[PDB]
Structures are given as C-alpha cells and as structure tokens.
Design a protein around this nucleic acid. Structure first.
Ligand SMILES: [Mg+2]
Ligand SMILES: [Zn+2]
Lengths: 417, 139, 515
RNA sequence: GUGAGAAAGAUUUGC
RNA sequence: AAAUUUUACUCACA
C-alpha cells in the first residue's frame, strides 16, 4: 500500500456502475468508498467480479497477496492487466497522460555513480593521434594498373596448365570412361574404400601454404553450369562419382587416420577433395585401358563448396550482359589480343569468379567503381587499394585477383573514361 | 520435474514474450547449408507431399489485378503506402474462425511501406509491388 | 564483366566471401589495432568537438522493448564453475532467461529498475550484485562475419553479455531518438534510397562532394567518447556503467582472454558514434563509418578535415574520394539532381537455396530493380524465365520432388513456367501465391525454420505456447498452469472447429478477397 | 539416428 | 594430400 497512487485510482473509476446504480470500483484512498471493517488487499475492489486490483509501475512490484489483480502501467502509453475488462477500462480511462512520481528515468543517478566515475578516471586513457596530411590528386591511370599486373606476374608467375579451370571444357571421354578413369585414379592414390565410397586419409600436415601461381585461361567454359551443379551435389553427398550430361566429378571426404577407431562417416566440418577430368596434355595426365585424361583436384571446406555450388552462372552472365560494352578478345594470360584472342575467355573469367570463395573480384570491382566515379583521390593511398595480394591466399584467389586487374586494365585500354 | 521449473529456475511466473521466444520456429534465415538441409531425410519432399494434399486445398482464390494507367519514366522518388492493420473486432472474429493468432496479431499493427519508384502517372497515384512500370494502381 | 558496364556496378551479382577459418586472427588483429590507436601513434581516438548542441533526454521515462532483448541470435553467458570464468555460447533468449533467473526478476525492466536503485555495488540482487554483473558484462566472445562483399578477409564480430545488451538497448534507443530529432534524414521510417535523395538535396548548393568512409571506425571510438555523448544526451548512470564495462572489456580468443581497453568492439554503438560526429557540426551526413559532405574551396576542405579529426572520424585515404557529378551514400549512387545513376548499381544475385525460396527472392529482386528503373520490364521477364529454367535444371529430380501435377513449377516436376507479369498480378494458380514477394512463406522456408528450431542451441522441451488471442498482451505474466490452460482451451476450440492446426493467415490475400 | 557433457556442432555469426 | 593450426571430441541410448 502506497499513497502515490491516490490520484491514479481516483480517475480510474469516475461513474462506472456494475449492476444498476452502484459504483463498480471503490477507491481505497477515500473513506466514503472504502469498505470499513475489512482488510485492504489493493487500491480498488470490483464488486461484480469480487476481486482486488492493485496498480504498479513497470518493474516495481508491490507487497500484495498473489490473489490480487495487478495492472501494469507501461511507459509507452499502453497498459497491461489480467482481466480484459480492466485492461480496456484502464486504456480508455487513462487516455490522459498523468505523471506518477516514482518512475525511474533514463537520466537517473545511482548511488554508485561517483565511484564508477572515479574508477573510470583511474583507468587508462588514449593519447591524441597525429594529424594526417592529405593531398588530393587525380585517380590512377592505365600505367599504375599495368604496373600492378606486372608486379603480380613477376612475383608469382604462371602454371603450365589451368588446373581446375580446364574442367570447364568437356573431355573426350564418355560416361563409362569417365567413371572408370576417376575410380582408377582414386585407387592409384591409395584412397581407402569403404561402404562403396572413397575416402582420403591423412596423418601429418606440412603446415605450410601450398605453392601459388596464376592459372592460364582455357579457351572457353561451356560446362560451367554443369560443373557448379556437380560441385554442389558432390559436396552434399560424397564418396561416389557423380555424373552430368557432359562431365563427371568425384568428391572424396578427407579424414584423419587414427588406426582402428578412425572416423568412418563425414561430419559437417569435414573437408572434401573434388576430382575432375579435363583434356590430356599436362603433368596431371592419367591413363587406364587406353583412356587418357588430365585429373585435377581442388581441396574445399564445406562452406567453400557450398558457396561455389550455389552461384548462378547463366543468370549472372545475362544480368551482366544487359548493359555491357563490347568485350575485347584476350589471350591465355589476359592480355589484349585482337589477332589470336578469344572472346569466350571472358566466360572462363566469370567461372573463375564463381570458383573463388574469397571473391576478391568483388573488392576489385568496388575499388574500380570508386575509381570511375572519382575526380580526385588521396595521393599514394588510393592506388594501394588495388594491392589485395596480402588479403588472399591460394592459386584460385590469386588468379581471380590477377584477372580482375587485367579486366580493369583492358577496360581502361579499350573503353577509356 | 516439469520443464518450466528448469528453464525458469527460481521464478514462478514469466512474461509471455519470454515464453514465446523460448519456442520460436517461424523465423527464416537464408544460409549456405540450405540444399543439404532440404535433402536431409527428404524433408522438403515430405513437406511438399503434405502441402499438396492437406494445405493447398484451403487457400482462397485471390482475384487478379485489373486496373492500370499510363505511366512515363520520371525522376526517382519514394512511394509511401500506408497499409492499415486489422481492427479489434476483425481480429476477434478471425481468431474465432480458427485463424492463427500470431499472424492476426502481427497484422493488427498499422504499417507503412516505402519503396523507390521511377515512374509517375498523370494523377500521381500509387502502384503495386513491381508493377509501377506497367501502371497497375493501388486504387 | 563488371569492368565493362556502361553505368555503375559494384559487382554484387555473386555471393560474398566465406570460409571455415577460425576467428582468432581477425580478433587479434582488431585488438592490436585498438591498442596501437590507444598509444596515439596511428590514428586519433581523443574527442575534441563540442556536443552542447545535442538535446538532453534525462527526464524521459526509462523504456525497454523486450522484442529485441529476446532473440535467436548468439550471445555469451558467463558462469563461475569453481573459481574461474567460463564463457558459454548460447542464444540471446537463453542468456536473458539465465540473467533473469540469477537475478530473480520477472522482466528486464524490473531488473534495470532494481539495478539503478541499489544502495551499493556490493548489495545483492537475487543471487548476484551490481559489481558481479559489471564484472561479468565485460566478457566477449569472438566470431567471424562471413559473406561480407568486398572483404576477402572476413572481419571479427563479438558476442556480448546479456547485461551489456540490456544497457545497450536503452542507450541506442535514446541515441536514435536524439538523432531523429537532430535531422530529418535519420527518421526511423526511411529507406536507403530516401536517405540518398535527402543527401542529394542537402549538398546541391556546393560544387565538390566528398564521399568519405572512416578507417578503423570501431577501434577509434573510445569509451571516453561514448561517455561524452551519453552525458551530453543525459544517460545518467546507465552510460557510466556501459563506459566502465567497455573500458575493461575482455575478449575470449580460442582459450585465452585478451584485454582490449580501446575501441568499441565492432559496431555496438553505431548511433552513439553517429551522434559523436553530428553533435559537433551540421555540415556532414554520416551513418556510422560512411558519410558525404560538400564544399566549394580548399579552405572548406581543410575545415572538413579538421572537423572529422576532432570527432574521431578518421578519414579513409584508401576509399574516400571527391566527385562533381556523383553522390555515393549508403551504397546508393545518385546524380547531383537526385536521380538514380544508370547501371546495375547494388543489384545482387540470388543464390540457389531452395527451389521456391530462390524464385521468391528473384521475384523480389526483379520487382525492386524494375520499380527503380534499373532495367525494363521485358528484361526482368526474360531473367525470371531463365531463373525458372535454371531452378528446373537444378531441382527437378527425385531427391526434392516426386509429383507431376501440371500446375506445379517445372522445378517440382510440373510443366508451368509462370510469367513475371502474371505472377505479380496474382493471375495464376494459388500454389504460386507463396512465390509472390508479398505472398505467404514457401514450403522450404517453413521446413528450414522448423529444422532450425530443432537445433542444439535452440532445442527445448517446453510446451510450445503459440496461436494466442490477439487481445492478450505479450507483457502479461504467466505460469505453467496458465499456459496449460491457454493451450487446452485453444486446442478444444480448434477441435470443435474441426481443424487439427490453425489455418495460415495472409494479410494481402485476406484484404484482396474481402468485398 | 536421439540425449547429455567439453569456453563447442552447423539458424553457425553480432550490432 | 591440399585454397595447410583446418580437414578433430567424449558419454548414454536406439
Ligand atoms: Mg561512402
Ligand atoms: Zn594439369
């Protein structure tokens, strides 16, 4: 019981009658309406329902028996209570906003404010930093992009073949030949066979990054949609060769070898080795029963495979082609070649963007958008935005970055802005 | 021992908000591991079978949009359309007819939708979702 | 291909980067950057501007919205097993429930009122005191934010204690209110394109436009700046407590706790930092770490740079640039007259996740593009047809479907390729209503939602309390017996009506079918 | 395949 | 073995 709610209860019931004439709710703060000779379990009593009603604020319960009906006066101009009638009657009656002293406010000062402020004062504080010097210059020209591309080329070089990009081109093998070649390649590598599926067992890790170079661009990527769909399917269900209309791939779970109790079934964190076939003529050739094909492997974690396989090649290509300029022919190294170049290699580049889970091409595209929209940029700092080699790691991401830079160079050379 | 005394140990009463939040199964998140989840246990196949035979023959047939007006490309602007919520009596009736209470409560609140539109008509009228270029009007 | 676009293009057609890399490296790098900025050798973290312009809201009632306090997203809960601190990764709902159980409070509002009205830090609130709460609220867990376009190396996000979330909710609500009062651009009901149009309207007077982004934004917003802003807007002891918790915060990397006295841990107080900038001047239109300003002469540019330095908004020399005929804000690019810049822009592709979710999201994206004038309607029609063909090629197999009904989509064993215009006008079979962007949820969405509800972090044996009477407030206190009675009555009514489960209600369909 | 326990299990990963 | 501290855990039950 408190005296702060006297006014609140008075306006709650003004002329509300329950049976014919008698006020339904009697305020306990007024002796005229209060019932003498009986205990008071609340600030209001409903004769019709024969129950007590107690008003309290948000988060400030009062000491009343559980049987008493509690009404909550929310701070956002709304009310909550047990009975529907009380909730509705309170809402209409309290349509006028009246402040009841005893409501905590955001600016409330607690008794420990001084102690906490002193503790904050005794804690470390930052030191003012140096004022930067900013010089605005014109955005980089074709020479800077060429320099970046040449730096990448010199630092990393090129592979002798497009390892997994070559899987975008149909090999000269049929379904049965492809399955036999993949199975025999798995057998040759000493992969464990269990429950009709292949598993790659590892014991020790060199714990050093794999060699990184730049993949040359195949002539075209006709089997891009099929390759992505097959990657998705295989990484969803692994161990057996999965076939498409014109190609097939094998997803092998990679598991630790622990002896007898070694893992038998893959979990959600198990990586996969995706093995694909391409035309012969590289160091990764493999022969069996007169069937020759280049076998190329990509090691993907489950998230990487899910990202790669869910991309839409056809829709992306069409959306890009909606408002695209003429694409110049390019060579194996991404250099402009109007004599022996091919315009289909651009599709390959797109496939590369789909195969790269780091999607550095998106960073390059954003920086190139800034470049195109910019009139002046910071000196010796906007250029550094094109040097993303330290951000990524691996053959596929490196090739994607290199060919994104090559695309920027080609755009600046063929369609200068 | 009941789950109420374990999940809410030390408390005899909790707000409906907390109890509802403890059992939430109507929030969708677009994630990479979607196709795998759908394939697992043929859950999507079973759900499609169930929908085609138990839920599909209950959706009312919605009349197609007819009214449209001539429109011309214009400067980008923001179209504000105010969709009002259900009335108290309407919500009570819909609940009494067996409609899911959560959806009715969600529709109870008045809402306003802002969308960028680059087409205008002579009378400066609103357009339906995605049909501004064709001129279909809210009316 | 993005390089050979006539208009503007951010290369958003593909999904963002992802990987299973552990978050140790990113969190360690962020902490090291924060420490370096603290030493005052790399960037500026000391606020110098005057915030007296901001209005004081100290007399406003302390209001908390429980909707954002309970959620299925992750959070860190601190317990003391024997004598050491153990940080467990739970859901925000579970963390809030545990906090209320230990403190023995019905709702978060009661907890905050009790915390603000104790005689001493050592006073007991249930099984814990304010001192214990502040000690536990300074612990954070680290995770990786993947699928962020343009960031090949994923950034580190942080999961906080339920008490930290409880205080941050109030602080950010009041900061957002003050921001809305400061300018008309920060209105709650405003889209990105509306904000960009207002920005264009604001900088039409001047000649040059500086489109700027801030570098190390989270590592340069010290607890001192947050406390300064909170005191300026009048947050009382809540702001002091939050600043104290932020100053002593510890991050659990792998299996070791690292102290990070600097920074604010990856966007916990976006509104507060926006206020830290907006209260010192009116020449900027900033949203956290992204802003646009305008100027005429190099002197104005120097003044802008000084203002940015004073407000601890360190300019990003790598990304910020100057234009005369362009305006980039909130990722949205507009011409100086306010019209949308021609080109793809921020159009994002729809990955293959569910046979029908993909179609619904593609419909939403195409509707957004067509309405904005990004592409003409026939192009959207062709793209929708192509997407339907691709979905058919990807999902039309026994694994996902076993039906052959004609009305079904070609990707579910059917033979119907719906036209985009036909779908948008609701002129199709009812089965296609779920594919409409404004239509019901699809089968895949419901299946995935249920499966998620069955996950380890979210699984519970509590008797579900769903399909409630609209007239019952969600702040009403209930017990086990009460929920049992409600469920029994509802099930009895449903069985009387002959329905085993409630019938799904769609606002659009109901409003259309009405006379 | 289900449950529980490891700073922890796939709606993971926050504002 | 590879896009190299990642591709790893325990118990009970069925
Ligand atoms: Mg910007
Ligand atoms: Zn090779």
């Amino acid at each position: 019981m408190d005296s702060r709610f006297a006014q609140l209860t008075g306006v709650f019931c003004d002329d509300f009658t329950y049976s014919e004439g008698s006020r339904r709710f009697l305020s306990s703060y007024s002796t005229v309406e209060r019932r003498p000779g009986v205990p008071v379990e609340g600030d209001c009593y409903d004769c019709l329902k024969n129950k007590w009603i107690a008003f309290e604020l948000e988060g400030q319960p009062r000491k009343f028996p559980k049987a008493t009906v509690r009404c909550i006066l929310n701070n956002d101009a709304t009310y909550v209570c047990s009975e529907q009638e009380y909730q509705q009657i309170c809402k209409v009656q309290f349509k006028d906003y009246l402040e009841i002293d005893g409501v905590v406010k955001v600016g409330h000062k607690a008794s420990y404010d001084a102690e906490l402020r002193e503790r904050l004062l005794e804690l470390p504080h930052p030191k003012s930093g140096p004022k930067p010097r900013i010089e605005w210059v014109a955005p980089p020209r074709l020479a800077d992009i060429s320099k970046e591309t040449a730096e990448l080329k010199r630092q990393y070089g090129f592979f002798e073949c497009s390892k997994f990009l070559a899987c975008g081109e149909e090999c000269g093998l049929d379904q049965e030949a492809r399955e036999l070649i993949l199975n025999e390649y798995a057998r040759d590598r000493e992969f464990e066979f269990r429950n009709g599926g292949w598993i790659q067992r590892y014991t020790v890790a060199s714990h050093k990054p794999a060699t990184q170079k730049i993949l040359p661009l195949p002539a075209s990527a006709p089997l891009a949609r099929e390759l992505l769909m097959l990657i998705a399917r295989s990484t969803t269900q692994a161990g057996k060769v999965l076939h498409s209309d014109n190609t097939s791939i094998l997803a092998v779970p990679v598991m630790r070898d622990s002896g007898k109790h070694s893992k038998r079934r893959p979990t959600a964190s198990t990586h996969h080795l995706v093995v694909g076939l391409s035309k012969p003529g590289c160091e990764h050739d493999f022969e069996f029963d007169g069937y020759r094909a280049a076998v190329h492997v990509m090691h993907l974690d489950p998230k990487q495979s899910a990202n790669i396989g869910e991309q839409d090649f056809v829709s992306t290509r069409e959306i890009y082609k909606l408002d695209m300029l003429e694409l110049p022919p390019i060579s194996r190294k991404g250099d402009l070649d109007r004599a022996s170049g091919l315009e289909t290699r651009w599709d390959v580049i797109l496939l590369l963007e789909c195969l790269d889970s780091t999607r550095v091409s998106q960073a390059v595209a954003q920086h190139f958008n800034r470049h195109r929209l910019a009139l002046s940029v910071c000196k010796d700092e906007f250029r550094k935005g094109y040097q993303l080699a330290s951000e990524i790691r691996g053959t596929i991401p490196l090739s994607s970055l290199y060919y994104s830079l090559c695309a920027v160079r080609l755009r600046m050379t063929v369609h200068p802005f | 021992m009941s789950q109420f005394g374990k999940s809410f140990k030390g408390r005899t009463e909790v707000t409906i908000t907390e109890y509802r939040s403890h059992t939430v199964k109507d929030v969708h998140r677009s994630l990479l591991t979607a196709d795998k989840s759908l394939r697992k246990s043929f859950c999507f196949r079973n759900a499609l079978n169930q929908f085609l035979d138990k839920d599909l023959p209950l959706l009312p047939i919605r009349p197609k949009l007819e009214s449209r007006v001539a429109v011309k490309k214009s400067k980008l602007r923001s179209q504000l359309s105010f969709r009002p919520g259900l009335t108290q009596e309407e919500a009570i009736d819909l609940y009494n007819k067996g409609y899911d209470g959560d959806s009715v409560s969600g529709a109870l609140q008045d809402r306003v939708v802002n969308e960028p539109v680059a087409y205008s008509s002579a009378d400066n009228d609103k357009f339906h979702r995605g049909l501004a270029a064709l001129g279909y009007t809210l009316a | 291909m993005w390089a050979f676009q006539e208009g503007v293009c951010k290369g958003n057609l593909l999904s963002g980067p992802t990987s299973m890399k552990a978050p140790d490296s990113a969190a360690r790098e962020s902490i090291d950057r924060a420490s370096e900025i603290m030493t005052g050798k790399s960037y500026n973290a000391v606020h110098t501007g005057d915030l007296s312009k901001l209005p004081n809201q100290g007399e406003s009632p302390l209001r908390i919205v429980d909707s954002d306090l309970y959620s299925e997203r992750s959070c860190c809960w601190v317990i003391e097993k024997e004598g050491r601190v153990v940080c467990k990764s739970t859901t925000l709902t579970r963390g809030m429930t545990s906090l209320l159980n230990t403190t023995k409070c019905s709702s978060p509002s009661e907890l905050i009122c009790k915390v603000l009205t104790v005689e001493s830090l050592s006073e007991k609130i249930g099984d814990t005191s304010v001192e214990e709460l502040l000690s536990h609220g300074r612990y954070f867990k680290c995770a990786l934010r993947d699928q962020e376009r343009g960031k090949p190396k994923s950034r580190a996000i942080f999961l906080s204690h339920p008490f930290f979330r409880l205080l941050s909710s109030v602080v950010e609500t009041h900061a957002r209110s003050v921001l809305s009062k400061v300018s008309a651009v920060y209105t709650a009901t405003a889209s990105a394109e509306q904000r960009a149009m207002m920005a264009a309207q604001v900088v039409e007077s001047r000649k040059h436009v500086l489109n700027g982004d801030c570098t190390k934004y989270n590592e340069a917003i010290d607890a001192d700046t947050l406390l300064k802003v909170w005191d300026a807007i009048g947050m009382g002891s809540i702001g002091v407590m939050l600043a104290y918790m932020v100053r002593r915060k510890c991050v659990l990397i792998k299996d070791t706790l690292v102290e990070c006295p600097g920074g604010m841990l990856m966007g916990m107080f976006n509104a507060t930092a926006t206020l830290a900038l907006q209260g010192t001047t009116d020449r900027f239109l900033s949203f956290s770490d992204d802003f646009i300003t305008s100027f005429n002469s190099p002197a104005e540019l120097r003044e802008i740079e000084d203002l940015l330095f004073a407000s601890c908004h360190n300019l990003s020399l790598k990304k910020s640039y100057i234009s005369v005929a362009s305006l980039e804000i909130n990722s949205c690019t507009l011409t100086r007259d306010g019209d949308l810049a021609t080109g793809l822009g921020c159009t994002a592709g729809v990955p293959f996740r569910g046979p029908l979710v993909t179609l619904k999201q593609t419909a939403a994206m195409l509707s957004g593009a067509v309405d904005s004038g990004v592409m003409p309607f026939h192009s959207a029609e062709r793209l929708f047809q192509i997407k339907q063909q691709e979905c058919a090629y990807r999902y039309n197999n026994p694994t996902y479907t076993t039906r052959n009904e004609d009305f079904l989509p070609t990707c579910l064993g059917g033979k119907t390729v719906i036209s985009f215009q036909s779908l948008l006008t609701w002129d199709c079979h009812p089965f296609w209503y779920q594919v409409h962007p404004d239509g019901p949820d699809t089968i895949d969405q419901k299946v995935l939602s249920v499966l998620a509800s069955k996950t380890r972090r979210r699984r519970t044996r509590l008797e579900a309390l769903s399909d409630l009477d609209p007239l019952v407030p969600h702040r009403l206190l209930v017990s086990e017996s009460d929920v049992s009675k409600i469920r029994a009555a509802r099930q009895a009514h449903l069985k009387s009506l002959g329905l085993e489960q409630p019938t799904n209600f769609n606002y659009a369909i109901y409003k259309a079918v009405q006379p």
